[PDB]
Design a binder for this molecule. Structure first.
Ligand SMILES: O=[N+]([O-])c1ccccc1O[C@@H]1O[C@H](CO)[C@@H](O[C@@H]2O[C@H](CO)[C@@H](O)[C@H](O)[C@H]2O)[C@H](O)[C@H]1O
Ligand SMILES: O=[N+]([O-])c1ccccc1O[C@@H]1O[C@H](CO)[C@@H](O[C@@H]2O[C@H](CO)[C@@H](O)[C@H](O)[C@H]2O)[C@H](O)[C@H]1O
Ligand code: NAG
Ligand code: CO
Ligand code: CO
Length: 434
């Protein structure tokens, strides 16, 4: 797709800290950009929509190539349309925002310039952020994560994408998402099926795969840390059900692991660690600091800070594994005890280290779940299981929770605030900010 300018595009500024092994940090000035799927897509020479509700214009978009030639992405009113605001080092994302239409959530990328994404090499380094999840009830996910996207949003590879990172193109993740309207400089109208339960979305014949590091998928009830490997590290198109992921009938596709080696302390048995109020180790009614470290072995370490008190990731005992480091032993114990082979099938932490050794783009989002009601995060899943099935219980939310229409109606002013992002060598991000 190309870019149009009927609506101006001004990326909300956002600062972050780059820290040094020598003990100092230096402020960096970036911004955020909303993913292309949230944008108005219209004809290049008129206001006629290329996509509206959950269907494509059959005349502008008779096939994927003609559609991209005829159509452009336009600018975003971040606050008034999308409920996205920033101030200094803080980003807030509202849940439901009512303007001329209803918008739900947002997916945002951290930029390096007005036209390029910021890339982070995670291996050897650590990433810290503050988060306020107090206004995230059951069924919501305020996510902070990394994906192996191209810094230009795909422009250099696909000529027919001229909108680029400035307009939030080029997304991929380990679901190989098929809900994307543009992939590889072409539309996704071919094979498009509108969602039965979402007036704004559908599933196309193509998806966009790449490695994904879920630092943080969480609400006020549960939180999870999850690396996802793919057989190809970076961005790659997939065909139909070969994509797997949430958007295919068979979740387990040909290239990516859509489940990951997840670490949710509640799921692992510590139901007192993270939750709302002073009866939890970390009180989710208040801001907390989350630090994630990528040691060169390929293992992942985690600690948290709240009220100046530090907590390592709680210890877990699972099969023959015991510890709090997310390593090969943890991931293979998890498969043995909870079931599944997706993570190891796609190459495990060894394959995942190939992603963290390269550049990845920072994503921050807020969503509800039109496929599984976020039950995998904060409830018992599958919902016919009990606490006696290992790993079935992931949080304390009712198995009835998280119906999108319901949570949108009841909790429209839910929000997540991410702040004070700091990045640098392991051991550096707790040092004084510059
Ligand atoms: O529910 N099961 O039948 C099952 C059995 C054995 C292992 C895992 C199971 O459920 C799966 O759990 C995964 C870990 O919680 C889920 O993976 C998450 O999926 C979400 C939504 O796609 C994604 O955002 C996370 O990053 C990912 O870890 C999986 O959905 C679920 O089926
Ligand atoms: O209370 N402590 O021991 C402590 C120690 C270190 C950091 C933070 C601590 O307490 C928390 O301090 C926050 C910042 O002052 C408080 O959050 C603020 O609360 C006010 C009043 O409710 C509110 O207007 C602000 O928007 C909010 O940030 C927090 O309540 C407190 O636990
Ligand atoms: C949960 O983790 C916290 C922090 O490590 C620890 O203090 C607490 O004892 C743990 N509780 C349980 C039930 O494991
Ligand atoms: Co094809
Ligand atoms: Co280690």
């Amino acid at each position: 797709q190309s870019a149009c300018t009927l609506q101006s595009e001004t990326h909300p500024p956002l600062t972050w800290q780059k820290c040094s092994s020598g003990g100092t940090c230096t402020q960096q000035t970036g911004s955020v950009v909303i993913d292309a799927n949230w944008r108005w897509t219209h004809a290049t020479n008129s206001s006629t929509n290329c996509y509206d509700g959950n269907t494509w214009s059959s005349t502008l978009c008779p096939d994927n190539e003609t559609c991209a030639k005829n159509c452009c992405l336009d600018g975003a009113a971040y606050a008034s349309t999308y409920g996205v605001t920033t101030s200094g080092n803080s980003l807030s994302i509202g849940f439901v925002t009512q303007s001329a239409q209803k918008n739900v959530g947002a997916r945002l990328y951290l930029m390096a310039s007005d036209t390029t994404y910021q890339e982070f090499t995670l291996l050897g380094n650590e990433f810290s952020f503050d988060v306020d999840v107090s206004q995230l009830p059951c069924g919501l996910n305020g996510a902070l994560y990394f994906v192996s996207m191209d810094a230009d949003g795909g422009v250099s590879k696909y000529p027919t994408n001229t909108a680029g990172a400035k307009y939030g193109t080029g997304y991929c993740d380990s679901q190989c998402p098929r809900d994307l309207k543009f992939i590889n400089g072409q539309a996704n109208v071919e094979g498009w099926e509108p969602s039965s339960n979402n007036a704004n979305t559908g599933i196309g014949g193509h998806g966009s795969c790449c490695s994904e590091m879920d630092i943080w998928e969480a609400n006020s009830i549960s939180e999870a840390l999850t690396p996802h490997p793919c057989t190809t590290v970076g961005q790659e198109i997939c065909e139909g059900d070969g994509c797997g992921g949430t958007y295919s009938d068979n979740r387990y596709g040909g290239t990516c692991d859509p489940d990951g080696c997840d670490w949710n302390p509640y799921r692992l048995g510590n139901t007192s660690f993270y939750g709302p109020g002073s009866s939890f180790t970390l009180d989710t009614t208040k801001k907390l600091t989350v630090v994630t470290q990528f040691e060169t072995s390929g293992a992942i370490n985690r600690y948290y800070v709240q009220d100046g008190v530090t907590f390592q990731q709680p210890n877990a005992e699972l099969g023959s594994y015991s510890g709090n480091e997310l390593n090969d032993d943890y991931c293979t114990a998890e498969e043995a005890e909870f079931g599944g082979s997706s993570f190891s099938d796609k190459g495990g932490l060894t394959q995942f280290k190939k992603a963290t050794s390269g550049g990845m783009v920072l994503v921050m989002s807020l969503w509800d779940d039109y496929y599984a009601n976020m039950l995998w995060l904060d409830s018992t899943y599958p919902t016919n299981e009990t606490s006696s099935t290992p790993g079935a219980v992931r949080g304390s939310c009712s198995t009835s929770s998280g119906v999108p229409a319901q949570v949108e109606s009841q909790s429209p002013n839910a929000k997540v605030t991410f702040s004070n992002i700091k990045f640098g060598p392991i051991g550096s991000t707790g040092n004084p900010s510059g």
